[PDB]
Amino acid sequence: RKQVSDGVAHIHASFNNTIVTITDRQGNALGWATAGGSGFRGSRKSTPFAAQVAAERCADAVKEYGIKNLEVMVKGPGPGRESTIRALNAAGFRITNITDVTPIPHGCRPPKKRRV
Amino acid sequence: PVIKVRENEPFDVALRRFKRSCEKAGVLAEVRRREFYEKPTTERKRAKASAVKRHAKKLARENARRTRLY
Amino acid sequence: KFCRFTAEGVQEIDYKDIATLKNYITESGKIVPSRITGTRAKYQRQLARAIKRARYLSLLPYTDRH
Amino acid sequence: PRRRVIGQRKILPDPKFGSELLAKFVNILMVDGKKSTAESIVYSALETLAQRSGKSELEAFEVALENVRPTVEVKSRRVGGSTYQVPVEVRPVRRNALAMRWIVEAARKRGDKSMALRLANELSDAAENKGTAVKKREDVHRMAEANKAFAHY
RNA sequence: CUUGAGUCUCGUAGAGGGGGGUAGAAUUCCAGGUGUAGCGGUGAAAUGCGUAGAGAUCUGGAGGAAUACCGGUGGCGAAGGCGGCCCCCUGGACGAAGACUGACGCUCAGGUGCGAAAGCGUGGGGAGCAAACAGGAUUAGAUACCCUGGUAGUCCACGCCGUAAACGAUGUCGACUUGGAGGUUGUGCCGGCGUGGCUUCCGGAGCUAACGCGUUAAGUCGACCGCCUGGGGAGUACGGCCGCAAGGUUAAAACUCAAAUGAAUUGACGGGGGCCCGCACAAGCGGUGGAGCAUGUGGUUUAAUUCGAUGCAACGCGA
Numbered sequence: 001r002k003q004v005s006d007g008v009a010h011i012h013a014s015f016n017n018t019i020v021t022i023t024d025r026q027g028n029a030l031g032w033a034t035a036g037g038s039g040f041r042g043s044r045k046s047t048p049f050a051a052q053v054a055a056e057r058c059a060d061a062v063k064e065y066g067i068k069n070l071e072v073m074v075k076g077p078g079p080g081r082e083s084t085i086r087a088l089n090a091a092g093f094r095i096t097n098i099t100d101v102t103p104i105p106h107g108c109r110p111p112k113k114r115r116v
Numbered sequence: 117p118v119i120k121v122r123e124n125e126p127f128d129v130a131l132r133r134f135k136r137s138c139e140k141a142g143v144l145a146e147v148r149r150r151e152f153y154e155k156p157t158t159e160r161k162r163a164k165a166s167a168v169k170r171h172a173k174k175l176a177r178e179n180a181r182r183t184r185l186y
Numbered sequence: 187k188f189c190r191f192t193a194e195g196v197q198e199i200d201y202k203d204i205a206t207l208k209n210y211i212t213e214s215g216k217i218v219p220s221r222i223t224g225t226r227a228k229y230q231r232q233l234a235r236a237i238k239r240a241r242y243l244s245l246l247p248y249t250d251r252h
Numbered sequence: 253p254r255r256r257v258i259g260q261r262k263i264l265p266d267p268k269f270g271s272e273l274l275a276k277f278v279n280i281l282m283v284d285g286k287k288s289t290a291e292s293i294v295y296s297a298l299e300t301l302a303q304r305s306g307k308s309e310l311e312a313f314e315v316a317l318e319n320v321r322p323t324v325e326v327k328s329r330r331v332g333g334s335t336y337q338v339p340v341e342v343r344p345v346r347r348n349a350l351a352m353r354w355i356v357e358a359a360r361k362r363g364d365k366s367m368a369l370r371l372a373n374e375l376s377d378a379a380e381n382k383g384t385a386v387k388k389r390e391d392v393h394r395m396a397e398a399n400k401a402f403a404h405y
Numbered sequence: 406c407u408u409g410a411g412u413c414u415c416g417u418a419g420a421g422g423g424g425g426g427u428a429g430a431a432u433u434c435c436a437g438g439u440g441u442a443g444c445g446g447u448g449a450a451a452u453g454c455g456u457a458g459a460g461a462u463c464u465g466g467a468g469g470a471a472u473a474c475c476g477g478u479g480g481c482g483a484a485g486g487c488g489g490c491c492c493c494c495u496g497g498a499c500g501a502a503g504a505c506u507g508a509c510g511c512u513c514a515g516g517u518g519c520g521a522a523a524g525c526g527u528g529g530g531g532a533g534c535a536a537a538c539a540g541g542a543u544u545a546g547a548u549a550c551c552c553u554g555g556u557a558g559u560c561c562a563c564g565c566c567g568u569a570a571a572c573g574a575u576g577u578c579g580a581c582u583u584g585g586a587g588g589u590u591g592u593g594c595c596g597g598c599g600u601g602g603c604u605u606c607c608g609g610a611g612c613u614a615a616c617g618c619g620u621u622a623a624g625u626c627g628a629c630c631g632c633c634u635g636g637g638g639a640g641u642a643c644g645g646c647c648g649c650a651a652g653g654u655u656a657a658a659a660c661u662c663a664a665a666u667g668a669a670u671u672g673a674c675g676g677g678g679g680c681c682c683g684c685a686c687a688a689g690c691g692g693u694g695g696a697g698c699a700u701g702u703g704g705u706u707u708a709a710u711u712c713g714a715u716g717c718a719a720c721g722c723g724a
């Protein structure tokens with residue numbers, strides 16, 4: 001219901017999926033969309049095109065908040081990193097910032113290597 | 117890799133600035149290396165194999181300047 | 187190259203000298219390799235030792251996402 | 253082939269309407285090297301197609317091609333044992349080849365008696381997006397949409 | 406006696422060791438806010454998690470464990486090994502200028518100590534990972550590989566174990582014998598010219614079965630120690646010693662074979678790599694496989710159903 005006009009787009013790009021969450025600058029999520037929920041399952045889900053469609057729906061899902069400009073925090077290694085940002089600019093948001101917030105331990109033991 | 121979209125910069129150049137700033141930090145190189153545990157024995161072998169080849173290529177290139185092909 | 191600590195006769199790198207120290211950390215707060223700054227191996231160890239001391243005293247940041 | 257060496261074969265133009273486009277349609281229709289038989293079928297379908305819409309002999313055949321010509325199709329490709337259908341933009345020459353081929357195979361499996369009429373009914377159906385060829389076109393296009401994610405090697 | 410060996414003086418570099426403290430990132434969990442339908446995972450899935458509100462995002466808290474960048478065929482240590490930062494205790498190496506002792510040395514069976522990881526005991530701790538285990542797949546089967554979880558364990562203290570491809574598969578000490586390019590750390594004289602320690606690669610003579618080693622030797626020699634005597638049986642049995650155990654250590658024989666083996670060569674092959682080709686795929690058109698008949702074969706039958714061809718490359722073939 002409430003107007004904001006200043007949001008943050010959190011792109012969570014993993015190898016298997018992309019989650020786009022548009023929050024307000026204090027971190028309260030206004031809307032979200034995922035590549036998996038866009039009609040893409042399995043192999044389709046991990047594609048830059050699917051992550052692009054996720055951004056298109058998250059722009060539509062937070063439409064009634066009247067967001068005019070947006071900061072972009074990209075997290076993760078997945079294929080839908082740069083694909084999502086171009087789709088958020090294409091939607092009609094003015095991108096204020098693009099920052100990487102991918103977590104790096106300086107940490108815990110990672111899982112064992114896959115023998116495939 | 118923090119990018120501020122400066123005044124009067126189009127998006128495509130600003131996004132190219134972001135990809136370049138991310139590669140200098142090596143965020144994607146660091147993430148892929150940390151997703152699986154690498155035994156200390158193997159992290160030392162790959163370190164040794166990387167040095168051995170970069171040395172051999174430096175040697176095998178230098179004598180390429182000392183040899184003709186035709 | 188040109189390790190500037192060998193050219194200026196430095197004896198210790200003095201973590202308090204933040205103006206000098208910030209020339210050897212990247213935009214994200216990471217120590218720059220001596221293969222890039224041309225620092226000599228002796229002073230690079232002092233340089234890294236100094237930077238980690240300044241990071242503890244919050245004179246320098248560990249990361250750019252603090 | 254592994255070596256490009258495919259200079260095409262000149263093709264004479266339709267004797268009646270002088271349409272290099274329509275000669276290929278006769279060639280696509282032809283069976284057993286019986287070209288005289290095929291031209292009669294094509295000619296008697298075009299006259300019927302023309303006098304059913306009144307437009308003309310030639311561009312009544314052209315407006316039917318428009319509803320059948322594809323603009324994108326999928327090519328097979330395997331990546332991890334599974335097959336990735338990669339959408340690919342059809343080049344202009346193959347757009348006509350597929351349109352003519354779809355029309356003829358759509359016509360051939362129809363219930364009309366004479367192929368001349370049987371073809372004209374399909375060329376008439378494609379004139380308003382109703383026949384099987386336009387159905388076979390939309391089936392191709394939707395698969396190129398469902399597989400749109402894989403537009404990269 | 407002073408050259409080998411050591412002592413002293415000044416400094417140098419170092420993840421050398423033991424004790425204590427502390428920092429930031431990240432994972433997990435706990436509580437709360439926003440929010441809504443998926444998340445997760447895979448070659449694809451499913452198990453699993455989620456409308457009892459997950460995942461995402463934000464706030465605060467708890468906890469353990471490891472220290473990104475620096476970081477380097479870099480450093481230190483007898484070896485095993487050692488990596489955030491700071492303090493305390495402590496070992497060794499090295500360099501310069503002398504002074505001092507005056508062969509005090511080298512090696513070492515037995516003996517003593519140290520000795521990765523796993524493992525054992527007692528008491529803590531337990532985030533992440535993960536033998537065992539459970540489920541989902543995959544598969545003919547799948548006691549696996551893959552997925553979702555997950556206990557010992559991994560962490561700490563004290564004790565035991567005493568073994569590793571504990572490898573440079575190269576015992577220690579000393580001397581001598583062309584070079585080149587680096588790394589690292591001292592030092593002398595004027596970026597240059599020297600002189601020391603440790604270390605990486607290449608290469609000469611020489612050596613080697615060859616591969617290769619090559620002043621850090623596998624070269625030329627000397628001192629002492631350890632070990633070997635064909636393959637399997639077998640580092641096994643029995644015995645002794647050691648250990649809480651798991652086991653370690655020392656260590657046979659009968660019997661059996663006529664080889665086992667190392668290095669290199671030429672091929673062939675690889676679900677190795679690279680570059681090419683072919684109706685090999687792809688793009689198309691028409692067929693065969695169904696029907697009737699023709700013809701050949703197999704089989705069966707027969708008195709005989711003459712013999713031959715019988716993957717591709719026999720089967721309208723000899724005919």
Ligand SMILES: [Mg+2]
Binds near residue numbers: 111
């Ligand atoms: Mg995994």
Ligand SMILES: [Mg+2]
């Ligand atoms: Mg001795």
Ligand SMILES: [Mg+2]
């Ligand atoms: Mg002994």
Ligand SMILES: [Mg+2]
């Ligand atoms: Mg242990």
Ligand SMILES: [Mg+2]
């Ligand atoms: Mg225990």
Ligand SMILES: [Mg+2]
């Ligand atoms: Mg216990």
Ligand SMILES: [Mg+2]
């Ligand atoms: Mg597992």
Ligand SMILES: [Mg+2]
């Ligand atoms: Mg042994």
Ligand SMILES: [Mg+2]
Binds near residue numbers: 572
């Ligand atoms: Mg080794």
Ligand SMILES: [Mg+2]
């Ligand atoms: Mg041995």
Ligand SMILES: [Mg+2]
Binds near residue numbers: 607608619
């Ligand atoms: Mg050599």
Ligand SMILES: [Mg+2]
């Ligand atoms: Mg035994």
Ligand SMILES: [Mg+2]
């Ligand atoms: Mg015994």
Ligand SMILES: [Mg+2]
């Ligand atoms: Mg084919």
Ligand SMILES: [Mg+2]
């Ligand atoms: Mg038949």
Ligand SMILES: [Mg+2]
């Ligand atoms: Mg016969």
